[PDB]
Design a binder for this molecule. Structure first.
Ligand SMILES: CCCCCCCCCCCCCCCCCC(=O)OC[C@H](COP(=O)([O-])OCC(O)COP(=O)([O-])OC[C@@H](COC(=O)CCCCCCCCCCCCCCCCC)OC(=O)CCCCCCCCCCCCCCCCC)OC(=O)CCCCCCCCCCCCCCCCC
Ligand SMILES: CCCCCCCCCCCCCCCCCC(=O)OC[C@H](COP(=O)([O-])OCC(O)COP(=O)([O-])OC[C@@H](COC(=O)CCCCCCCCCCCCCCCCC)OC(=O)CCCCCCCCCCCCCCCCC)OC(=O)CCCCCCCCCCCCCCCCC
Ligand SMILES: CCCCCCCCCCCCCCCCCC(=O)OC[C@H](COP(=O)([O-])OCC(O)COP(=O)([O-])OC[C@@H](COC(=O)CCCCCCCCCCCCCCCCC)OC(=O)CCCCCCCCCCCCCCCCC)OC(=O)CCCCCCCCCCCCCCCCC
Ligand SMILES: CC(C)=CCC/C(C)=C/CC/C(C)=C\CC/C(C)=C/CC/C(C)=C/CC/C(C)=C/CC/C(C)=C/CC/C(C)=C/CC/C(C)=C/CC1=C(C)C(=O)c2ccccc2C1=O
Ligand SMILES: CCCCCCCCCCCCCCCC(=O)O[C@H](COC(=O)CCCCCCC[C@@H](C)CCCCCCCCC)COP(=O)(O)O[C@H]1[C@H](O)[C@H](O)[C@@H](O)[C@@H](O)[C@@H]1O
Ligand code: HEM
Ligand code: HEM
Ligand SMILES: CCCCCCCCCCCCCCCC(=O)OC[C@H](C)OC(=O)CCCCCCCC[C@@H](C)CCCCCCCC
Ligand SMILES: CCCCCCCCCCCCCC(=O)O[C@H](COC(=O)CCCCCCCCCCC)COP(=O)(O)O
Ligand SMILES: CCCCCCCCCCCCC
Ligand SMILES: CCCCCCCCCCCCC
Ligand SMILES: CCCCCCCCCCCCC
Ligand SMILES: CCCCCCCCCCCCC
Lengths: 534, 51, 54, 143, 51
């Protein structure tokens, strides 16, 4: 019944060797090699909750008088887009749940990629040969941000409408062809007909298709290079040490997959997001104090706040002050996209790297990363500096000046501290290899000298003083519990003491197990050595 | 080697759990369900009662 | 029941730890006070990872 | 600590005597530069101030009974008498700094009187205290 | 971008300063269901220099 389904599926696709190859691929097990999955799962939730969300939504700007589930706002003249978005939360059973799931998933998606990009950056996974992946991923994050932006602008409420007003007036104030380009996008003056239609047709099709295509290409390209991994015992630059796809990797992927799905289902219910009923229909005259776009869009708005009034008047023409903002954001994007190329120009090393490197061993790049993180965080904080100012009792003018000055001295201090801390971590790593683990046994010698017991990880010469082990690019133990010298040697339940008979054998078995593991790992190391000398 | 064939209870409950999860995921599709015989809100207009 | 890791002491005219007295001047070692350190590099089960870059 | 357990009786009995003088002298003496009546701050906090010294004194007294003659408590002791192990001192830890940062977060939480900030700061403090204690207990990484 | 609604002043229209009274449509249900009238309702109203 099962032997026969495979028989007549192989007899026609000759897939025995093709499938065996896929199910035997080995993947490195590290918690930081999973952060990419979070983005994938959040993306699946978005496109699935999004499709459900389009069965009840009318993206029209046509004004109507509201009569619906929301008893307030009855009799209020609103757009068709706002009225239907207000209907999918008060007239659709479990529609608010799905709407909130969608928005939460959007947030997680952007944070699922940012953190992933940080992992890629710090560990050096963008090096040869993985630069197409870096470029693809960078395009992915920019498009994700753009997608999120046009998503929350669909309801056409008062808060989102101001975002569109800002965006339109940014475009219109571009040198030379910013007037024609603005009229080409919106189809006329803002607001326009066929403005919520072009955005809705590019948020549920153009961007999704592009994103899906890029993602699929991204994953396939990753599966071709079969990942990267940290330096460790037995692992070289021409092998992958981890677990096979089945039965271990596939199940773990599903398990974590549904974990993310379940977590998004919790926030969708217990936590409110984008309460559009309190915001009212878009009106060009009405505005609110907290008009921040969204967390991933805060950096752009923060850039616009800290840019001084630097207009260039050229007779019959004028360059707005916001033009420089555009220039600056353009530079930040260009710096981010073409990083592998700039890093390898100033390092002069392009040597097909398959082994990762710990952030502590690359202080310049790590420090640049933390420098850039502080830059981004300051822009993000400045983007919502009016809610910071009130809630934390700080002058708003002082906040603007903190943003302005902090963008110069914040990055500088971040670099200095991070560099020093990286070297500090390197130094602590060498003390252990040179002298051994600092055990907490302060013995007094007969003469009266207080001495700390040191545990060597290597062979000693004559009288302690271990032969210094060379750095190996891996994590060195720092405590004695990391060698299992604190392991609980009492099998049983919380109440159950467990029979000694079955308790003796199990400790013996585990002892023989980790002995064999260590033996096989060191044999792998030896193999690499005598392989590398030919 | 997974030793799942021997655990009748684990795989039995796992099946039930997975089915319930699936049904939980697809349940908000019941927001589309509408009773054809429930008259639309408000008094009867010139287009009838909606039924 | 007595834990395996409990120090092998005569339960006569001697107690290893009570409410207020102990055998050391300071905190007891969390890896057994009767454990002799250091040990051979073999017992630690630390495998020095040979790595070559490029 | 043979003499340490004893010298606390000095402050204990002193403060006990002052607390009883204070209560009786404040509730029965009319000076004209004040009013008559027992003072309920210098009384409670001076009775209970003697309590601290008494507590520590008694505890150290009970402890010192069941300790042998230590080399540090012996007048003519050789340096080689304590030759042995002085127990376990933590070589390093990042958690003190973290948990100071956590108390700082809760501090500003209470200052601004933000409920979320107080709640987060409280559970940011539990976490760091827990990690401080479980530092040398973190099991060898099981694959 | 040159023009707004105030440009009507140039071509001999008398524009007032209209204050927004935020008036909404009124429900009027009678024998043929419910309808929102919004007739006789003015959301912009003239304002005086003592107001
Ligand atoms: C359990 C699994 C059940 C199967 C369903 C899973 C769905 C997708 C399978 C993914 C696993 C295979 C991954 C893989 O890469 O192995 C290729 C593998 C062969 O590997 P191989 O022997 O090394 O071949 C060498 C090259 O790959 C040969 O390369 P080539 O030069 O001959 O060009 C071939 C290239 C195709 O050409 C290109 O696109 C290359 C571009 C050329 C540009 C010039 O790609 C392929 O190999 C096509 C194979 C996949 C067909 C498309 C997927 C069909 C699923 C849709 C049906 C369901 C609805 O092919 C398969 O496994 C056959 C796919 C079986 C599809 C079953 C059809 C559905 C019937 C279900 C009935 C249920 C009852
Ligand atoms: C609320 C607090 C929640 C934060 C908890 C984050 C959980 C992250 C998961 C985790 O711990 O993974 C285990 C992870 C080790 O992973 P593993 O698998 O065991 O080791 C793999 C390799 O050995 C690789 O490990 P490794 O030996 O190479 O060391 C990795 C270490 C590299 O080691 C370093 O050199 C660290 C130096 C950077 C920190 C200096 C901060 C500068 C302050 C800016 C001042 C502005 C003025 O981490 C980094 O790569 C640095 C990247 C992120 C730095 C961003 C710091 C935030 C600045 C923004 C200010 C606003 O533990 C860490 O090392 C934690 C770092 C992960 C990112 C957290 C950011 C640092 C927090 C500092 C800010 C204070 C918080 C308030
Ligand atoms: C002044 C305030 C000072 C605060 C700074 C100290 C915080 C240090 C963070 C701990 C993480 C680093 C670490 O594990 O050891 C270092 C570790 C290297 O040592 P290692 O050999 O790997 O051994 C450590 C163990 O692996 C680590 O042991 P493990 O494997 O058991 O731990 C894994 C993981 C635990 O596993 C988890 O993933 C835990 C998940 C978090 C649960 C949270 C519960 C709520 O650890 C964590 O992620 C713990 C981080 C929680 C820290 C929370 C306290 C932060 C203070 C809050 C201030 C907030 C200010 C708001 C900003 C306002 C801006 C206006 O990696 C690093 O070097 C990372 C450096 C982090 C920067 C520290 C330098 C700060 C300088 C700032 C200038 C001021
Ligand atoms: C490959 C590659 C890119 C290589 C680099 C080589 C190269 C030729 C680079 C180009 C030159 C360069 C370094 C910089 C160009 C800088 C310029 C002139 C950029 C203008 C581009 C342009 C039309 C930008 C559109 C305007 C944008 C992005 C505005 C930002 C913005 C948007 C889009 C919002 O929606 C928004 C919503 C709510 C609040 C705020 C904002 C906000 O600030
Ligand atoms: C793939 C396997 C499929 C298995 C199906 C199991 C899936 C579980 C979840 C199903 C969705 C939720 C089920 C019931 C949800 C529920 O409670 O809805 C009421 C219920 O219906 C009734 O009473 C009569 C009973 C009808 C049966 C309902 C159960 C649905 C099953 C039988 C159909 C699916 C099976 C088909 C296979 C699908 C494959 C695709 C081909 C309608 O009364 P109503 O009064 O109209 O309420 C209106 C508000 O809903 C509304 O928002 C509106 O706003 C209000 O005005 C109000 O009218
Ligand atoms: C749409 C969001 C993204 C998804 C779903 C995604 C997905 C993945 C997945 C599943 C992997 C496999 C390995 C792993 O989990 O770490 C991976 C690897 C990788 N991704 Fe991403 N990624 C995304 C965004 C990015 C971004 C923004 C960048 C770069 C700026 C990037 C660069 C890389 C690189 C270099 C690798 C290789 C890591 C390695 O092979 O060691 N990705 N990605
Ligand atoms: C690609 C990832 C996506 C992101 C980051 C994203 C983001 C968002 C955001 C932030 C909103 C505002 C939701 C709210 O008002 O609470 C939204 C709304 C919406 N999205 Fe998406 N979305 C994505 C994909 C999709 C897809 C693929 C579809 C359709 C196939 C879709 C259809 C919708 C619809 C109909 C709305 C309705 C506006 C509303 O009901 O609020 N989205 N999206
Ligand atoms: C060589 C490095 C030079 C550092 C420049 C420092 C110059 C500041 C002086 C501006 C000024 O005070 O003149 C006002 C003038 C009357 O108005 C203008 O025309 C504005 C001049 C345009 C400046 C846009 C700067 C864009 C910033 C980002 C692109 C950089 C982020 C990285
Ligand atoms: C990563 C960058 C983020 C960008 C933010 C830019 C900086 C401006 C921040 C403004 C903060 C406003 C704070 C405030 O006014 O507080 C409150 C308003 O906003 C909030 O409630 C903050 C919620 C933040 C999430 C905390 C969740 C705690 C549960 C943890 C369970 C895991 C007012 O105080 P209250 O709610 O009444 O206690
Ligand atoms: C004893 C002969 C019949 C069983 C041979 C195995 C059938 C082919 C299995 C192919 C598996 C592809 C998924
Ligand atoms: C984008 C240019 C990067 C330049 C980084 C230099 C940081 C300077 C910090 C001061 C270092 C003192 C030793
Ligand atoms: C040492 C000076 C103390 C101040 C005067 C003490 C007054 C004694 C109170 C006795 C009251 C009898 C009830
Ligand atoms: C009417 C006079 C009564 C005085 C009582 C003094 C008591 C003070 C010490 C209280 C300690 C509480 C812990």
């Amino acid at each position: 019944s099962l032997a026969t389904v495979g028989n007549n599926l192989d007899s026609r696709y000759t897939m025995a060797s093709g499938i065996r190859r896929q199910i035997n691929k080995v993947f490195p097990t590290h918690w930081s090699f999973m952060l990419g999955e979070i983005a994938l799962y959040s993306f699946i939730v978005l496109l699935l909750t999004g499709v459900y969300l389009t069965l009840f939504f009318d993206p029209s700007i046509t004004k109507v008088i509201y009569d619906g589930g929301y008893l307030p706002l009855n009799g209020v003249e609103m757009s068709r887009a706002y009225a239907t978005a207000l209907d999918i939360s008060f007239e659709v059973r479990g529609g608010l749940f799905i709407r909130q799931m969608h928005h939460w998933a959007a947030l997680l998606f952007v944070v699922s990629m940012l953190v992933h990009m940080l992992r890629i950056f710090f560990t050096g996974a963008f090096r040869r040969p993985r630069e197409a992946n870096w470029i693809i991923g960078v395009v992915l994050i920019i498009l994700g941000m753009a997608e999120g932006f046009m998503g929350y602008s669909l309801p056409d409420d008062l808060l989102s409408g101001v975002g569109l007003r800002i965006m339109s007036a940014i475009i219109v104030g571009l040198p030379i062809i910013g007037t024609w380009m603005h009229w080409l996008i919106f189809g006329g003056d803002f607001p326009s007909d066929l403005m919520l239609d072009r955005f809705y047709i590019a948020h549920v099709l153009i961007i999704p298709a592009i994103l899906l295509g890029l993602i699929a290409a991204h994953l396939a390209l990753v599966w071709y290079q079969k990942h990267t991994q940290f330096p460790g015992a037995g692992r070289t630059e021409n092998n992958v040490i981890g677990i096979r796809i089945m039965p271990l990797f596939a199940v773990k992927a599903v398990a974590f997959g549904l974990i993310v799905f379940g977590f998004l289902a919790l926030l969708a219910g217990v936590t409110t997001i984008n309460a559009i009923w309190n915001l009212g229909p878009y009106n060009p005259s009405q505005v609110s104090a907290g008009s921040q776009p969204d967390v991933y869009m805060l950096w752009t708005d923060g850039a616009a706040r800290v840019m001084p009034a630097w207009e260039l008047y050229l007779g019959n023409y004028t360059i707005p002050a916001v033009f420089w903002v555009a220039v600056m954001l353009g530079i930040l994007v260009v710096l981010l996209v073409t990083y592998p190329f700039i890093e390898r120009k100033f390092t002069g090393d392009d040597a097909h790297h398959n082994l990762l490197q710990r952030p502590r061993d690359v202080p310049v790049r790590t420090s640049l990363g933390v420098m850039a993180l502080v830059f981004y965080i300051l822009l993000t904080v400045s983007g919502g500096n009016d809610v910071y100012a009130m809630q934390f009792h700080v002058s708003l003018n002082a906040m603007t000046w903190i943003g302005r000055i902090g963008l110069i001295v914040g990055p500088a201090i971040a670099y200095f501290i991070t560099y020093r801390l990286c070297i500090g971590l390197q130094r602590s790593d060498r003390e252990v290899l040179e002298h051994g683990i600092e055990t907490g046994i302060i013995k007094q010698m007969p003469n009266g000298a207080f001495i700390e017991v040191h545990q060597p990880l290597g062979p000693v010469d004559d009288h302690g003083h271990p032969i210094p082990l060379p750095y190996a690019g891996a994590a060195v133990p720092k405590q004695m519990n990391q060698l299992g010298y604190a392991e609980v040697e009492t099998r049983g339940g919380f109440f159950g003491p467990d029979p000694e008979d079955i308790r003796a054998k199990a400790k013996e078995i585990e002892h023989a197990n980790h002995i064999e593991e260590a033996n096989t790992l060191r044999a792998l190391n030896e193999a690499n050595i005598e392989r590398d000398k030919n | 080697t997974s030793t799942l064939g021997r655990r009748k209870l684990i795989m039995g409950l796992a099946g039930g759990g997975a089915v319930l999860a699936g049904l939980t995921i697809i349940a908000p599709m019941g927001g589309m369900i509408k009773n054809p015989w429930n008259p639309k809100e408000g008094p009867m207009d010139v287009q009838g009662d909606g039924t | 029941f007595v834990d395996p890791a409990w120090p092998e002491h005569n339960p006569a005219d001697g107690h290893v730890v009570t409410e207020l007295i102990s055998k050391v001047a300071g905190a007891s070692s969390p890896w057994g006070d009767d454990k002799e350190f250091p040990v051979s590099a073999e017992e630690t089960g630390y495998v020095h990872p040979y790595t070559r870059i490029n | 600590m043979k003499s340490s357990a004893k010298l606390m009786y000095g402050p204990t009995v002193f403060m006990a005597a002052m607390a009883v003088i204070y209560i009786f002298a404040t509730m029965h003496v009319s000076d004209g530069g004040s009013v008559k009546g027992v003072e309920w701050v210098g009384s409670v906090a001076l009775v209970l101030s003697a309590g601290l010294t008494l507590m520590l004194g008694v505890y150290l007294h009970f402890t010192e009974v069941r300790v042998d003659v230590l080399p540090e408590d012996w007048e003519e002791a050789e340096v080689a008498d304590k030759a042995g192990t002085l127990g376990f001192f933590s070589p390093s830890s990042i958690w003190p700094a973290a948990m100071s940062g956590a108390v700082g977060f809760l501090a500003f939480g209470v200052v601004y009187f933000h409920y979320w900030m107080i709640a987060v700061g409280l559970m940011l403090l539990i976490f760091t205290i827990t990690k401080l204690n479980l530092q040398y207990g973190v099991p060898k990484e099981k694959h | 971008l040159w023009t707004s609604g105030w440009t009507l002043v140039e071509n001999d229209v008398k524009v007032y300063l209209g204050r927004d009274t935020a008036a909404i449509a009124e429900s009027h249900t009678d024998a043929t269901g419910e309808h929102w009238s919004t007739t006789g309702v003015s959301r912009l109203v003239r304002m005086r220099p003592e107001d």
